[PDB]
Design an enzyme around this catalytic site. Structure first.
Site, PDB file in Angstrom:
ATOM      1  N   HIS B  41       0.828  -1.280  -0.045  1.00  0.00           N
ATOM      2  CA  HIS B  41      -0.162   0.010   0.062  1.00  0.00           C
ATOM      3  C   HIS B  41       0.952   1.270  -0.191  1.00  0.00           C
ATOM      4  O   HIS B  41       0.173   2.409   0.098  1.00  0.00           O
ATOM      5  CB  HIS B  41      -0.989   0.094   1.117  1.00  0.00           C
ATOM      6  CG  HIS B  41      -0.534   0.105   2.631  1.00  0.00           C
ATOM      7  ND1 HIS B  41      -0.463  -0.870   3.569  1.00  0.00           N
ATOM      8  CD2 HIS B  41       0.144   1.360   3.110  1.00  0.00           C
ATOM      9  CE1 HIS B  41      -0.074  -0.393   4.602  1.00  0.00           C
ATOM     10  NE2 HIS B  41       0.560   1.173   4.422  1.00  0.00           N
ATOM     11  N   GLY B 143       3.156   5.589   9.894  1.00  0.00           N
ATOM     12  CA  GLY B 143       4.640   5.766   9.543  1.00  0.00           C
ATOM     13  C   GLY B 143       5.060   4.289   9.947  1.00  0.00           C
ATOM     14  O   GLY B 143       6.241   4.169   9.450  1.00  0.00           O
ATOM     15  N   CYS B 145       4.142   1.305   9.257  1.00  0.00           N
ATOM     16  CA  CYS B 145       4.134   0.038   8.509  1.00  0.00           C
ATOM     17  C   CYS B 145       5.321  -0.291   7.850  1.00  0.00           C
ATOM     18  O   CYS B 145       6.175   0.541   7.646  1.00  0.00           O
ATOM     19  CB  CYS B 145       2.877   0.386   7.272  1.00  0.00           C
ATOM     20  SG  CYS B 145       1.435   0.415   7.996  1.00  0.00           S
TER      21      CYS B 145
HETATM   22  C1  LIG Z   1       0.986   2.322   8.092  1.00  0.00           C
HETATM   23  O1  LIG Z   1       1.967   3.133   8.754  1.00  0.00           O
HETATM   24  C2  LIG Z   1      -0.377   2.598   8.908  1.00  0.00           C
HETATM   25  C3  LIG Z   1      -0.182   2.100  10.193  1.00  0.00           C
HETATM   26  C4  LIG Z   1      -1.619   2.512  11.128  1.00  0.00           C
HETATM   27  C5  LIG Z   1      -1.421   3.877  11.309  1.00  0.00           C
HETATM   28  C6  LIG Z   1      -2.190   4.069  12.467  1.00  0.00           C
HETATM   29  N1  LIG Z   1      -1.855   2.796  13.306  1.00  0.00           N
HETATM   30  C7  LIG Z   1      -1.347   1.991  12.492  1.00  0.00           C
HETATM   31  O2  LIG Z   1      -0.971   0.818  12.820  1.00  0.00           O
HETATM   32  N2  LIG Z   1      -1.428   1.902   8.266  1.00  0.00           N
HETATM   33  C8  LIG Z   1      -2.261   2.452   7.681  1.00  0.00           C
HETATM   34  O3  LIG Z   1      -2.795   3.868   7.845  1.00  0.00           O
HETATM   35  C9  LIG Z   1      -3.610   1.379   6.943  1.00  0.00           C
HETATM   36  C10 LIG Z   1      -3.394   1.797   5.541  1.00  0.00           C
HETATM   37  C11 LIG Z   1      -4.341   0.832   4.880  1.00  0.00           C
HETATM   38  C12 LIG Z   1      -4.414   1.061   3.308  1.00  0.00           C
HETATM   39  C13 LIG Z   1      -4.272  -0.685   4.892  1.00  0.00           C
HETATM   40  N3  LIG Z   1      -5.000   2.035   7.358  1.00  0.00           N
HETATM   41  C14 LIG Z   1      -5.111   2.107   8.674  1.00  0.00           C
HETATM   42  O4  LIG Z   1      -4.591   1.573   9.487  1.00  0.00           O
HETATM   43  O5  LIG Z   1      -6.351   2.754   9.051  1.00  0.00           O
HETATM   44  C15 LIG Z   1      -6.771   2.693  10.229  1.00  0.00           C
HETATM   45  C16 LIG Z   1      -6.113   3.770  11.046  1.00  0.00           C
HETATM   46  C17 LIG Z   1      -6.435   3.958  12.481  1.00  0.00           C
HETATM   47  C18 LIG Z   1      -5.970   4.998  12.976  1.00  0.00           C
HETATM   48  C19 LIG Z   1      -5.194   5.927  12.592  1.00  0.00           C
HETATM   49  C20 LIG Z   1      -4.850   5.718  11.172  1.00  0.00           C
HETATM   50 CL1  LIG Z   1      -3.961   7.097  10.498  1.00  0.00          CL
HETATM   51  C21 LIG Z   1      -5.462   4.818  10.441  1.00  0.00           C
END
Ligand SMILES: *[C@H](O)[C@H](C[C@@H]1CCNC1=O)NC(=O)[C@H](CC(C)C)NC(=O)OCc1cccc(Cl)c1
Ligand SMILES: *[C@H](O)[C@H](C[C@@H]1CCNC1=O)NC(=O)[C@H](CC(C)C)NC(=O)OCc1cccc(Cl)c1
Ligand SMILES: [Mg+2]
Ligand SMILES: [Mg+2]
Lengths: 301, 301
Positions: B41, B143, B145
Site C-alpha cells: 500500500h 508511518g 507500516c
Molecule cells: C501504515 O503506517 C499505517 C499503520 C497504522 C497507522 C495508525 N496505526 C497503524 O497501525 N497503516 C494504515 O494507515 C492503513 C493503510 C491501509 C491502506 C491498509 N490503514 C489504517 O490503518 O487505517 C486505520 C487507522 C486507524 C488509526 C489511525 C490511522 Cl492513521 C489509520
C-alpha cells in the site's frame, strides 16, 4: 495507537558486550574504546564472597589472569584497575563498534532498557524502573552480572546501570558505570534486604494520561483536588509525594489531553479509594508506575 | 530469578531497516541481500485507499518512482514486483548486514518481538502474541507500516510479521513476509473488525509454571482434574480448548516443578471461578496469556 512497555533498540549495546573470565568465574563486560568495564566481584572465589578485601585481591592479579572474549576473538588485557565496584581492563584493541556514549547516574523513578547477557552473548531486552528503594525488578540468572541498563538519545547511548546481584526478595541491585551502587548495597554475599518501597506517583499519572490518549476514559471525573489534599491521600496509600516539579513535567501531557494535572489527581484519588471494580486500564488491573512522562510522550503522539 | 516480558535483542534486524517513499507516502522496508520488502500500500494515494486495484497501480509505476534510503545512502531500485500484499524492490546493492534468516508463518498463540520503526529508523522493541483472532496488541503510529516481527534462533532471524494496519478496536493486523495476511483482513481502508478473541490456555498454564519457578505458590491446590472436565471450564470462560499436544509441550515445565499439567489445570479452574482475591501472580492481577512455554523455559532455568 496502543501502549506497550517498550525497550530501546539494543544493537548499539550488543556490539559492546564481551565475556570476562577470571579463574572459575565468568560474567559480562562492556567494551568501549580500549577499556572493558565489569563488576569487580569477578576476581572473587567461592570463599572470598562472604567479605572480600578487593584491594588485596586485585594486587594479587596480573593481566594474564583476565580472559576477555569478544565473540571468538580473544582480547589481550594490557592493564587493569578498580574504580569503586567496577573493574576496568585496558585491552590492546579499541572496539570498532563503540557508539557515541555517556555514563549517567539516574534518579529513582527513571526507566531504562536492560540488555540481559550471558557469556558475553545478549539474550533479551526489557524495560526497568529504578525503584524509590534503589532496586530494580528484573530478570537475571547466574552469569548475568555485567549486563547493562541504558537509554538512547539520538544515537547516543547513555549507560546508567551495571548488574551485580539479587536480593532475597527476588529484586536486583547494581551500580552506575563508575561503580557506585544505587542504594545502600555492597558487593558481597551477605544479608542485605531492600528497604520498603513506595509507588512512583508521577509515573502513575503519566500512565493515566497514556490511557486517555489511547481512549480509556472511564476513570475520569469532574472533580479537581489541591496538591496538599492529594498528597495526604498519597501518604495513606504509600505513594510518593507529588511535587510542583512533577506537575510541570506532566505539562505537555496535560495540554495534549486538556486534563489539568490536579484534575487527573482527583481520578487517581478515587481509583485508590475505590479500586477498579473489575475494569482495566491499558490492559492492567493494577495502577502501573514504571512509565515516565518521557516514556509516554515518546510512544503517544 | 524474576520474570519479565522480554524481547529478542534487535541489532540483527536494525541493520535491515530502510525507508521506502513512493509519492507522498513513506513507510519502512526490510533490506535482505539485494531485495527490499515493504507493504504494497506504499503505492496508494489518499483516494486509492478505499478500494485500490493494486495490479493497475503497479503497472503504472517505474523503478524511479521508489525512493529507498538506507541511513543517508540512497539505494537505487533496479526492479519491482508484487507478491500477495508485499512489494519487492530489487536494489543494486546487497545489504552487507544481512543476517542468517528465514521467513516463517506462525500459528496463533505464538509470540515474537516487534521492532517498531519510523522513517527507516528503529524506535523501540517489544513482545507480541498472535491472538487467536489473528490480531496483535501492539503500539503503532502512522508511518510504522513495514515494521517487522521476528524471533531469533541461534543467530538466525526468523521473520514472521510485517505491519500493515490498525483496526477500529485499536489492535493491529499484518502479513507474513510473503505478504499473506494473518486473519481475514485485506489492505484497504474499509470497515474491518477483529472477530471475538479467546484466551490462550496453554500460555496461561506456562505462565503459572513460571510463577511457581519464581516462588509464587499461593494459587496451588491438592486437586487434580481431567482434561475433559477442564475443557468444560475453559469453554465457559472463553479459553481455548487444551489439547494433548499442549499437555506434552508443557512437559519440561511440569517436570521441573513436579506439578502435573492436569494438577496445574485444577489451580487455573479455581482462579477462573474465584478470582485472585486481591493477590497477584508475577506482579499481575490478571491471568497473562502472552508467554509461550518456550518463552518461560528460555527465561526460567
Ligand atoms: C501504515 O503506517 C499505517 C499503520 C497504522 C497507522 C495508525 N496505526 C497503524 O497501525 N497503516 C494504515 O494507515 C492503513 C493503510 C491501509 C491502506 C491498509 N490503514 C489504517 O490503518 O487505517 C486505520 C487507522 C486507524 C488509526 C489511525 C490511522 Cl492513521 C489509520
Ligand atoms: C552475577 O552474575 C550474579 C547475578 C545474580 C545471580 C542470581 N541472580 C542474580 O542477579 N550475582 C551474584 O551472584 C552475587 C555475587 C555477590 C558477590 C555480589 N550474589 C548474589 O546475587 O547472591 C544472591 C543470589 C540469589 C539467588 C541466586 C544466586 Cl546464585 C545468588
Ligand atoms: Mg477529575
Ligand atoms: Mg492442583
Amino acid at each position: 495507537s496502543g501502549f506497550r512497555k517498550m525497550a530501546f533498540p539494543s544493537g548499539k549495546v550488543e556490539g559492546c558486550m564481551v565475556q570476562v573470565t577470571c579463574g572459575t568465574t565468568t560474567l559480562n563486560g562492556l567494551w568501549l574504546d580500549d577499556v572493558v568495564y565489569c563488576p569487580r566481584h569477578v576476581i572473587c572465589t567461592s570463599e572470598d564472597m562472604l567479605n572480600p578485601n578487593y584491594e588485596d585481591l586485585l594486587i594479587r592479579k596480573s593481566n594474564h589472569n583476565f580472559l576477555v572474549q569478544a565473540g571468538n576473538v580473544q582480547l589481550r588485557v594490557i592493564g587493569h584497575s578498580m574504580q569503586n565496584c567496577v573493574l576496568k581492563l585496558k585491552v590492546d584493541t579499541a572496539n570498532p563498534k563503540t557508539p557515541k556514549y555517556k555514563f549517567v547516574r539516574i534518579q529513582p523513578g527513571q526507566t531504562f532498557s536492560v540488555l540481559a547477557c550471558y557469556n558475553g552473548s545478549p539474550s533479551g531486552v526489557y524495560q526497568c524502573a529504578m525503584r524509590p528503594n534503589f532496586t530494580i525488578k528484573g530478570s537475571f540468572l547466574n552469569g548475568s552480572c555485567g549486563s547493562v541498563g541504558f537509554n538512547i538519545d539520538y544515537d547516543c547511548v547513555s549507560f546508567c546501570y551495571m548488574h551485580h546481584m539479587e536480593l532475597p526478595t527476588g529484586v536486583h541491585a547494581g551500580t552506575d558505570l563508575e561503580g557506585n551502587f544505587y542504594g545502600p548495597f555492597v558487593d558481597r554475599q551477605t544479608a542485605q534486604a531492600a528497604g520498603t518501597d513506595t509507588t512512583i506517583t508521577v509515573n502513575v499519572l503519566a500512565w493515566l494520561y497514556a490511557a486517555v490518549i489511547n481512549g480509556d476514559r472511564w476513570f475520569l471525573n469532574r472533580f479537581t483536588t489541591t496538591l496538599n489534599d492529594f498528597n495526604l491521600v498519597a501518604m495513606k496509600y504509600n505513594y510518593e509525594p507529588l511535587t510542583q516539579d512533577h506537575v510541570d513535567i506532566l505539562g505537555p501531557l496535560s495540554a495534549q489531553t486538556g486534563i489539568a494535572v490536579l484534575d487527573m489527581c482527583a481520578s487517581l484519588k478515587e481509583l485508590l479509594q475505590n479500586g477498579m471494580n473489575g475494569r482495566t486500564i491499558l490492559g492492567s488491573a493494577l495502577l502501573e508506575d514504571e512509565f515516565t512522562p518521557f516514556d509516554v510522550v515518546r510512544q503517544c503522539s
